[PDB]
């Protein structure tokens, strides 16, 4: 019934769209012909996007699973033939001029409901081909994302990892379930065994995943190259208007401040007191856990929020304060939607070590901070260098073999966590295990996004002038197709290095008021 | 050709490329400029595709070998920018008229050599798209075949198959280069562990093989209909003028004549004495020189001037044929006749019985197992275009089913045996194995005509061997592939020599 509702559906697009014939050819008779063609496309497209994104959601949760399978290939099918069939569209509006597109547009009221979507169209001008050429590239559509499937299948449904000892000195199977929680065991042989286990078996599969990875990347060009783009990077991030200048400068600032990460390393070397950091201690615990109506903290953490805002354990603590914060966003309307999560993470962070006395909890939140900024600014910009190297290389024409993909990675590795984290040889193989490098441009995103934030707490938390009624503005702008100028409105200029730079200051002046409680202690 | 050599290669033919785009657009101007210009496209599109073709192929011997993987990437990445910066050709020749062309031809006889290949791209006027079309999918040409690509870095480099006891305390490695004759061998628990072993890995990774096979699968099928063909079977059969109807009749009358397949396993599990007969039982043997120079005795005058045998025959097939479907019926041909001379010859029932066998064992395999995978084939195509997902169970059910429908009741089910699609490397050629079997039934349609000394057999045989058509070919050789008749008549051979093998038997 699943698939019986979907059956449904697709008999009625499928019959939908064939008066994509009575449309196609008439954009150029008038301003209602205009309106009632964008309506027919639109509709058609976006009840097949909403099936797909669905069936896919389902695939990637079972990929072993036939019905699920199934669903998602007929679902594809449906997409393609869609896209295929409405392909005709944006090549057709962009055969009238710019002046008789906004000149029907006065004629008829009716289409400034589309403005912003005709738009995106007539400036992009450059980048939409011609029907017979939008016609392939669309009908062809399953085909160049073959191998992110073929990934996601192996990854998920074919691959099986060893057996280990575990931590009663029971046999445990390794998967992708339990593989994280055996990463953080206090237990450091469990630690080392689970991350050799699963390794042994990415090492041997290197061959595949270069040859699924490398397709998609493949296609990533090839499509910016016909489309007159630049590079892959500039096609992904232009249909966000994205400049590429936030990309260099993120990872510009990141490679300048390295050895801020090195420090933090060094200081887990030294609270773990192991002869060698391997990659497998960087996610068991350092601390552990702090000794503490959780409600109450919140509100009074957020006050600086104001009182607009406000009408409208200690790990729990973050995800309900991260949570209100995503829940105050949504009353007004995703990486924008995760600022105003962070935000708040940020400003209870700050509260907790403007009010705690204990030596042990300011340490625990200390190093949470410096943790999280481990993870979403150091190793996500990590990866969007990776895979933007991916691109560029291979776009030059070099190729992309494990062999070099892999003496690539573990290079870059070295480069991000300096002489304190020993250079161990399964990670050089990490680059095929993660699935955000079959997105496109996806990653580093976090990283801007975690910066921004900072940014944003930083001008609140000390009452700049228009710092609370800006950022406000930027909750009720909600989700837009212009990232950038909001947060530009909201004082955040992304295109330039400063508010990475605070964000680096603040993980530095956390990183030395952590060691010397160490020290203290 | 070696590598050094391809390299050379490679380095000259990136050069020439700079000059493609200096004879776009001149096809209309005259007979010396549409000869530069053909001159030119063919020469590099050619040689590239040569040192592709190469590249392809270390890669396939050596997948784990970074220095071919590489070689290859370098190979294919020249090759679709060749293919991408010579697509305007043949759209550009195809805006002249038939009668223009050929009138270039008249004025300029050194086009004479190129006649052929300019009748291919006129004959297929329906299926060359524009120039706009022909340079997005010939650059895309990498994209299209990938997942070949990735089945052949899987299955090569990759996959770890068990290890087995051998027939000593010897640990063998499975693998594919030493698989056949793990099944070969006279020890059964070899055998049986050997087979269990190699499908435990395909079991296992049925749903990245779907995923490679489908996708493959699906390009075919949208190349097809971009181009205005009725289905991916016509338009690789349309390449060398192969009417689907071949391909039809091909399955119609082997599935028609399976139950000859069914009694040869009845009486392979009778000669191996077991009382269930396996998949992994079908390879081991049932059974325990200018001979060559006289064997050929019936070719005629022209013509001229217990394995090992064989062979030469087959090679010395082919070496004739040259003072590959068609070099393959004259090998054949040739063997057919020993199996004959052989037949007539021997005077010791226990050499009759063994050549009896190696035919039909020969015909089980080049017939039946080679058309059972194009039956295959076609049917992923049918039911991929139809909408229908080929999801490894499904792939796998639909395997089984074929499997027991053309084995018949002698042979257990085996479960193993569902997976068998995922490990067959022909899967991602373009409708390939079935001209295995065509010719195999072609050269026995006219080794009958020759045994038989028929009116202008001999003749037309040596003219056959003195194209692009091979239809025609074998039909002005009397053999009309088209019909059911030359597959039913060697069916009725495999019936006949199969009747005299189990007849002598008692």
Redesign the interface.
């Given at each position: 019934l699943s698939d019986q509702e979907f059956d449904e559906k697709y008999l009625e697009l499928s019959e939908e769209l064939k008066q994509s014939e009575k449309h196609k050819g008439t954009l150029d008779q008038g301003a209602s012909q205009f309106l009632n063609a964008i309506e027919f496309v639109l509709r058609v497209y976006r009840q097949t996007e909403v099936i797909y994104v669905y069936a896919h959601l389902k695939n990637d949760q079972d990929?072993?699973n036939?019905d699920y399978?199934?669903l998602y290939?007929?679902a594809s099918?449906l997409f393609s033939k869609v896209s295929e069939a409405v392909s005709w569209f944006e090549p057709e509006i962009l055969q009238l001029s710019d002046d008789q597109i906004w000149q029907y547009f006065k004629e008829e009221p009716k289409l400034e409901v589309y403005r912003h979507y005709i738009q995106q169209i007539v400036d992009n001008r450059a980048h939409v081909l011609?029907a017979?050429?939008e016609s392939?590239?669309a009908?062809?559509g399953?085909?160049?994302d073959?191998?992110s499937?073929?990934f996601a299948?192996?990854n998920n449904?074919?691959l099986?990892f060893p057996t280990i000892e575990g931590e009663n000195g029971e046999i445990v199977q390794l998967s992708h379930g339990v593989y994280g929680q055996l990463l953080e065991s206090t237990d450091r042989r469990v630690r080392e065994a689970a991350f050799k286990g699963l390794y042994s078996v990415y090492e041997?599969?290197?061959?595949?995943f270069?040859?699924?990875l490398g397709?998609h990347i493949?296609?990533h060009n090839?499509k910016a190259?016909?489309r007159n783009y630049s590079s892959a990077r500039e096609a992904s991030l232009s249909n966000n208007h994205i400049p590429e200048s936030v990309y260099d400068t993120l990872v510009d600032v990141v490679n300048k401040h390295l050895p801020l990460l090195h420090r933090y390393m060094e200081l887990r070397k030294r609270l773990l007191e192991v002869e060698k950091l391997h990659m497998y201690d960087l996610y068991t615990p350092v601390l552990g856990e702090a000794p503490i109506e959780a409600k109450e903290k919140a509100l009074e953490a957020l006050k600086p929020m104001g009182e607009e805002y406000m009408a409208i354990t200690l790990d729990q603590l973050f995800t309900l304060v991260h949570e209100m914060g995503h829940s105050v966003h949504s009353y007004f309307t995703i990486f924008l939607a995760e600022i105003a999560s962070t935000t708040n993470e940020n400003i209870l962070t700050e509260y907790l070590l403007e009010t705690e006395k204990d030596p042990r909890v300011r340490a625990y939140v200390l190093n949470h901070y410096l943790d999280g900024f481990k993870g979403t600014v150091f190793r996500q910009t990590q990866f969007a260098e990776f895979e933007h190297f991916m691109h560029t290389e291979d776009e030059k024409?070099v190729?992309?073999?494990?062999?070099?993909l892999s003496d690539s990675y573990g290079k870059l590795n070295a480069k991000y966590y300096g002489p304190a984290v020993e250079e161990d040889p399964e990670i050089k193989f990490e680059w095929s295990r993660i699935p955000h490098f079959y997105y496109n441009y996806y990653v580093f995103q976090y990283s801007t996004g975690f910066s921004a934030a900072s940014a944003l707490a930083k001008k609140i938390l000390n009452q700049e002038p228009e710092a609370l009624e800006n950022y406000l503005a930027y909750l009720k702008a909600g989700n837009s197709d212009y990232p950038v100028e909001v947060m530009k409105k909201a004082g955040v200029d992304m295109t330039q290095a400063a508010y990475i730079e605070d964000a680096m200051s603040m993980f530095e002046q956390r990183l030395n008021e952590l060691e010397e409680l160490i020290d203290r202690e």
């Open positions: 990929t072993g036939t399978q199934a290939a007929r099918s011609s017979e050429q392939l590239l009908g062809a399953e085909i160049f073959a191998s499937d073929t299948v192996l449904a074919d099986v041997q599969f290197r061959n595949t270069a040859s699924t397709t493949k296609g090839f190259k016909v024409g190729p992309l073999t494990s062999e070099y």
